[PDB]
Design a protein around this ligand. Sequence first.
Ligand SMILES: CCCCCCCCCCCCCCCCC[C@@H](O)O[C@H](CO[C@H](O)CCCCCCCCCCCCCCC)COP(=O)(O)OCC[N+](C)(C)C
Lengths: 57, 70
Amino acid sequence: GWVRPDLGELSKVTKVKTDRPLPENPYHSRARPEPNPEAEGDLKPAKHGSRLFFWTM
Amino acid sequence: WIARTFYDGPEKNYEKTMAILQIEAEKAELRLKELEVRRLMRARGDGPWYQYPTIDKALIDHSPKTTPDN
Ligand SMILES: CCCCCCCCCCCCCCCCC[C@@H](O)O[C@H](CO[C@H](O)CCCCCCCCCCCCCCC)COP(=O)(O)OCC[N+](C)(C)C
């Protein structure tokens, strides 16, 4: 009582019911380095201007 | 009459010199601090400056790759 699969059937994406636990770290990755402090605040005018040699602005 | 018509009291020049000295001392302190901060950031690389680019992580394709072991 075997029915031959039709065209387009064996190439389907199916689903599997399994009791195997999903690996949390399959890549064996290390701990990622901490990012930069990503500073945030309110801009204020540069203190005493450019401060380049004799320039006052 | 010359002092009344053309010149000003000593206090004006005194206090103006105090203000000028304050401003320029602050500027010198800021210049030293800028040099030190630049040295530290360039040595460490943990600040906003001297951040050289790296490969974006949004470019990596996370999909089965025709082979289980990537
Ligand atoms: C018997 C008398 C003996 C003494 C004679 C004294 C004569 C003085 C002549 C030489 C003076 C030189 C000028 C000295 C100062 C000029 C620059 C500056 O310091 O003065 C300015 C002011 O200058 C004067 O307004 C103008 C002086 C111009 C003098 C010109 C004299 C010669 C003119 C010749 C013209 C001839 C006629 C034309 C013929 C064709 C700014 O003063 P100001 O910031 O306000 O002062 C405020 C003081 N407070 C704050 C205490 C109130």
